[PDB]
């Protein structure tokens, strides 16, 4: 039964992965064909940039403002900055904005989402000058609505660009994310690729490569059928008509995912999708953002994301019926991930209970082989030798995401740290108990059996491989070869002041 299970797992994962790669390659090819036909200095589309943040590092906010000012797009109307707060501490970001941009800072005493007149003309009079708004501290979602209203009051603009306060944008990032809007009138939103600049931590590099691979394969396959669900921060585009149509339903929904942060990124895209509007994603637009360096913070963030996804699965599945022939890929990939998680759980339980050395060695060997193939593809696509480090993502995935998923399911099933980390501690204890039970059960040595010799050679080779990879990563830390070239510049500039 173990051989059948591992063979089915391998063939199913390989087939789905190959299909995703083919879809992403086709989407990239058609996007390149579309881009190759555009004329030079194309600035037909007028766009506005909206920045929202709260308790953001002044250095990062200033760098984001500079990156926005470094854009080469020649059809930028205005910049909208909204701060979710009007206190003394919230004025540091306003002062930072005054250093980089004009001193047109407004401090309204009311919130547009909670006012009778939600039009942006109540708090703004001139549309040519850039404006800064210090709204009362309500939440991330309220900040975005004010920016939408400020952008909507000017009929000259045709689209908006949504970025985070810590996002670093390239010179051509704005043009690339807004170009495909005019290519197809059915396109109302475009997603932008996000990269992690800081790679000075073991977890940071793993999550950076995971995000890069995710953007390449899942978002690429979704963009091939034009049914992307993750569009918005930290780099994305939206047409004015769709946001004007769906601003009220987005803000009238009940929000309980997080406190005073974590705006509803996926819900806006789901609202767009339920109206039958195609949404594409482009990899040419590159954005830079930081990633958590603490394992506990990463675990809780992934748990929150898992709870949000488990809440919005019903909506994202119901939104696929309008697409007709297309849209079944959403249910297909949801079932793929669900069955993958269930199969991982079942395989782990089976190997823990039966404690068969022959099957465990084959399972770890095939898992290592498929992970090495994925890392090799990542290296080939990114043209970087550091993509082979993705092989260590399996450990952090197994030790962080699975307990996070169990916690997310338990919370919504039918003491602050008890509901956050106790489940993870119990999972770790169970894993350790299963491992010790397995090793004590098969505690013997017999060099006269080829199967035992094969299992020992396989496990020794796996241990040697992981040890040498860890040694190489450790050597890269002192050599600073693993450091992102953009990260080094930021470190030097921070050292300067």
């Amino acid at each position: 039964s173990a051989v059948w299970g591992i063979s089915v797992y391998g063939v199913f994962v390989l087939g789905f992965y190959i299909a995703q790669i083919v879809f992403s390659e086709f989407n990239r090819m058609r996007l390149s064909d579309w881009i190759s036909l555009r004329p030079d200095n194309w600035n037909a589309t007028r766009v506005a940039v909206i920045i929202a943040g709260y308790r953001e590092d002044p250095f990062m906010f200033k760098k984001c403002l500079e990156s926005v000012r470094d854009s080469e797009y020649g059809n930028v109307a205005r910049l909208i900055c909204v701060i979710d707060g009007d206190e003394e501490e919230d004025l540091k970001m306003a002062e930072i904005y005054k250093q980089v941009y004009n001193d047109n800072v407004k401090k309204p005493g009311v919130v547009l989402c909670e006012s009778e007149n939600k039009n942006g003309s109540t708090i703004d009079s001139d549309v040519s000058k850039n404006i800064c708004i210090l709204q009362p501290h309500r939440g991330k979602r309220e900040s975005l609505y004010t920016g939408f209203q400020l952008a909507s009051m000017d009929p000259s603009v045709h689209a908006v660009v949504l970025i985070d306060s810590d996002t670093v944008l390239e010179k051509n990032a704005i043009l690339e994310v807004v170009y495909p809007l005019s290519c197809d009138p059915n396109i109302k939103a475009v997603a932008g690729e996000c990269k992690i600049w800081n790679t000075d931590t073991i977890l940071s590099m793993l999550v950076s490569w995971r995000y890069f691979s995710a953007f390449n394969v899942e978002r690429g396959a979704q963009s091939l059928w034009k049914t992307v669900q993750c569009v918005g921060g930290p780099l994305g585009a939206y047409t004015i008509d769709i946001i004007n149509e769906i601003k009220d339903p987005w803000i009238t929904q009940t929000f309980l995912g997080n406190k005073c942060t974590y705006g509803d990124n996926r819900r806006l895209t789901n609202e767009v999708l339920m109206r039958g509007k195609k949404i594409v994603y482009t990899p040419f637009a590159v954005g830079w953002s930081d990633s958590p360096t603490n394992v506990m913070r990463y675990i809780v963030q992934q748990t929150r994301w898992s709870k949000s996804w488990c809440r919005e699965i019903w909506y994202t599945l119901g939104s696929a019926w309008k697409h007709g022939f297309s849209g079944i890929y959403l249910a297909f990939e949801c079932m793929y991930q669900i069955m993958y998680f269930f199969l991982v759980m079942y395989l782990f339980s089976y190997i823990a209970i039966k404690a068969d050395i022959r099957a465990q060695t084959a399972t770890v060997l095939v898992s290592t082989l498929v992970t090495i193939i994925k890392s090799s593809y990542l290296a080939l696509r990114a043209k970087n030798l550091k993509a082979f480090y993705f092989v260590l993502y399996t450990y952090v995935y197994f030790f962080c995401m699975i307990p996070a998923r169990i916690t997310a399911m338990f919370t919504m099933f039918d003491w602050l740290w008890a509901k956050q980390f106790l489940i993870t501690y119990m999972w770790w204890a169970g894993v350790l108990a299963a491992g010790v039970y397995s090793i004590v059960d098969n505690w013997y040595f017999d060099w006269a059996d080829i199967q035992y010799r094969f299992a020992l050679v396989g496990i020794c080779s796996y241990l040697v491989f992981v040890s040498i990879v860890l040694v190489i990563y450790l050597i890269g830390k002192i050599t600073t070869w693993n450091y992102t070239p953009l990260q080094k510049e930021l470190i030097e500039e921070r050292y300067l002041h």
Partner: nanobody
């Protein structure tokens, strides 16, 4: 530490079949390598058939197509099927157990556990 006991044998003519089984008392019999040895009155013990923990079967000197070895972990016993017996096969059979060992699985000194042995005769 496992104690080996023997139960079986008999007086059967040429071409008969016998079923010999060995019972072991211990803690973890599921991870012990079993082997069978026979001592003729005119020679010394030799390896004829053995089974490892991973159900690997080893035979030599025509035993490949003559005898069959199997083990039952649930009953904590090991048995060696015997078919097409010959008069020259008359010898007392000794079972052996081992937990740690190397490539050598034929010499008597490789196995650190032995049994009292049961007498098997062919007429």
């Amino acid at each position: 530490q496992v104690q080996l006991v023997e139960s079986g044998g008999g007086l059967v003519q040429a071409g008969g079949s016998l079923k010999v089984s060995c019972a072991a008392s211990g803690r973890a019999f599921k991870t012990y390598r079993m082997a069978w040895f026979r001592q003729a009155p005119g020679k010394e013990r030799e390896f004829v058939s053995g089974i490892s923990a991973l159900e690997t079967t080893y035979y030599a000197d025509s035993v490949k197509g003559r005898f069959t070895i199997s083990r039952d972990n649930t009953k904590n016993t090991v048995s060696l099927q015997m078919d097409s017996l010959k008069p020259e096969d008359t010898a007392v059979y000794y079972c052996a157990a081992r937990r740690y060992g190397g490539t050598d699985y034929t010499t008597t000194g490789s196995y650190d556990y032995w049994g009292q042995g049961t007498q098997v005769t062919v007429s």
